[PDB]
Amino acid sequence: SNPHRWMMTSPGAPMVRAEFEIGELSADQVVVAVAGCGVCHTDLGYYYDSVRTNHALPLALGHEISGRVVQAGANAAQWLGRAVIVPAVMPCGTCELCTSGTICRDQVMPGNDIQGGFASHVVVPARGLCPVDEARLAAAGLQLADVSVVADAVTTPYQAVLQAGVEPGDVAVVIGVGGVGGYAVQIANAFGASVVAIDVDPAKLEMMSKHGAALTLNAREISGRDLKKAIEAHAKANGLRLTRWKIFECSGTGAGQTSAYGLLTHGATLAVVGFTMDKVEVRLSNLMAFHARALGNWGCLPEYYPAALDLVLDAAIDLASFIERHPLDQIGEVFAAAHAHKLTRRAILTP
Amino acid sequence: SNPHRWMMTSPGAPMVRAEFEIGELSADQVVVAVAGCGVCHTDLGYYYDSVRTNHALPLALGHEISGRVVQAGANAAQWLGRAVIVPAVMPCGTCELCTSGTICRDQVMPGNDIQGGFASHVVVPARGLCPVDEARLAAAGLQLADVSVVADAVTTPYQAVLQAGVEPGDVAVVIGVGGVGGYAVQIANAFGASVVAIDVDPAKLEMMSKHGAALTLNAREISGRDLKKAIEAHAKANGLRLTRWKIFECSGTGAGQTSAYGLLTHGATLAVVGFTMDKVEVRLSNLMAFHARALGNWGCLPEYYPAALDLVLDAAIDLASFIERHPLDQIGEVFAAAHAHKLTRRAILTP
Ligand SMILES: [Zn+2]
Ligand SMILES: [Zn+2]
Ligand SMILES: [Zn+2]
Ligand SMILES: [Zn+2]
């Protein structure tokens, strides 16, 4: 009857099942009954890399949540009974930076600032919730649990592609085609680009070959120079621009960043999507010679969640080949498998 | 009677005076009688760093030219007798990249692609010439020779400031306040920013204090952290934004680039204006945390030369405190003095 969460008591300690009572809600809170929560590099950071959470321990992680609003504060009652995706990052929506949001000084994330989605239920602010059309979901052969990874995994690269002005005629180049990079490929394709997938993993390439990558390049097989000349071949074959390439570093490695920076051409955009604390060695002045720009992406404004979901509902992109469902009570095994890079798809924990 | 040039026969060889005959011009060429040619880091690169020129030696350097059109091909005759600034870089204006220019694959520069302005006369294409209102020049206590440095030295940072969307309420921060950086300060001020001048040279700061720098910070005296906190003081004093700072790296050093990258704040723009082949160590992912962008500037579209000159004519910026006039036949002494960093202003060689 009572809900439960699986919490981190300490980084690397076994996750502990903990019942909790909802009680009275504040005016602008809802309870979502969790269908699914994605397992993210950000969660593994808290657990394995002991990254500080803003909420004190113990804390349930998980910030990629779909489910149903089953209880609501008086101001949020219009959410009752509706299928939703919770935004991974909720800007204050009231500060001058939100008025004019991704960097909002008062932005809040589940599984960091408040109790997360590795739970039967999660209490979240109602601001920025994305409704799911349940008819359209069912048609597409998708569970409500499946669209959990629209939060962050789809929306982060959606924001990055939109911000880079990816348009028909363009070559899009994405480095690191697991997780976020996989969706950068699918979305750049949907936006009208001819996409080049670059990864060290042949299986990832094979997969992206079937879902929007017009070209694949194994970065193990091929140094900086062959990389460029292979993409120009692709461009000239299909009558595509040889300038103004839209490059997305999605691996979040120094190796990927060196490799992406290496592929700058005249008027190109380099989108920095993958987070790492690693420093690279680059000559900043390459940006000058190419009259190029480097655009830093942080997450995704909630306002874009409906459009990203729309891509999924309409089969313009595919989630199903990129997700795998596990029991929430196997969170330990899944965390351990994701950390050892044993997972070939994004894990969704399901109560 | 015959014109003459001072040519580089070989990098580091004494410059040699060489008479030449103009002869018949092609349809779209003019002869400018040189009033003045600026002495640029780019010239010193050819001479001291043996950077390859596209024209074979011997070659007269100099690409920052003002003077009078005294002869013209039939298609260019409307230029005859007019005071001009020659663009430092002339895009083809006919390629699809110019149609839609700074990076144009067919772009031409005096003192690199064709004979330069260290000469009594220079034969240039008429495309992109900037007329000078001689009445307005005289009023402002300026020689026609003086506006030679509008080419590159003023226009390069004009392009960079325009491209960064520098607007009232903004804090502009320019690192390296000699030459191009000095004009980035003056132009950001004219555009409505409150400008912070950062340099290692106290005399440069003193100077910029008098010409658009609302604040000066000696980068010798003060590490990364005090730098930020001093600028926030300035911002809060005058009611200015603490985000979306417009940062211009104008020194073209790794030291300056590290220092500028270090000053990224939320929504900031980092303009890369100074060229160097030096590589820096930075975490590219700072661009993400700040939702920031890095914009590479190459030169300036000829179309902006009238607006930049307009700033000079109208006293909105000042050239006079930033120039020093020398005889063209002292090119050797001036090259040697600029290379040893003995010059406190931009040298203009005058026939
Ligand atoms: Zn995530
Ligand atoms: Zn806000
Ligand atoms: Zn120059
Ligand atoms: Zn062109």
Numbering used by the authors:
A (entry chain A), B (entry chain A): 3 to 102, 105 to 355
Task: Show passages lifted from the paper.
In this context, we determined the X‐ray crystallographic structure of the wild type (WT) ThaADH in complex with NADH, refined to a resolution of 2.60 Å, as well as of the double mutant K319A/K320A without cofactor, refined to 1.80 Å. Second, the K319A/K320A double mutant, which was obtained with one molecule in the asu and was refined to 1.80 Å, but no density for the cofactor was observed in the omit maps. Four cysteine residues coordinate the structural zinc in the catalytic domain: C94, C97, C100 and C108. Resolving the structure of WT ThaADH and a double mutant and comparing this to related well‐studied MDR−ADHs with preference for phenyl substituted and linear aliphatic substrates, gave novel insights into the underlying structure‐function relationships, which in the future might enable the rational design of MDR−ADHs towards acceptance of a wider range of diketones and their corresponding alcohols.
Among the few candidates, the alcohol dehydrogenase from Thauera aromatica (ThaADH) stands out with a high activity for the reduction of the cyclic α‐diketone 1,2‐cyclohexanedione to the corresponding α‐hydroxy ketone. The results obtained confirm the previously observed preference of ThaADH for cyclic carbonyl compounds over aromatic and linear aliphatic compounds. This preference is in line with the physiological function of the enzyme, i. e. the oxidation of the cyclic 6‐hydroxycyclohex‐1‐ene‐1‐carboxyl‐CoA within the benzoyl‐CoA metabolism. The overall structural fold of ThaADH was consistent with those of many other MDR−ADHs, i. e. contains the typical C‐terminal coenzyme binding domain and N‐terminal catalytic domain. ThaADH shares with many ADHs of the MDR family the presence of two zinc atoms per monomer.
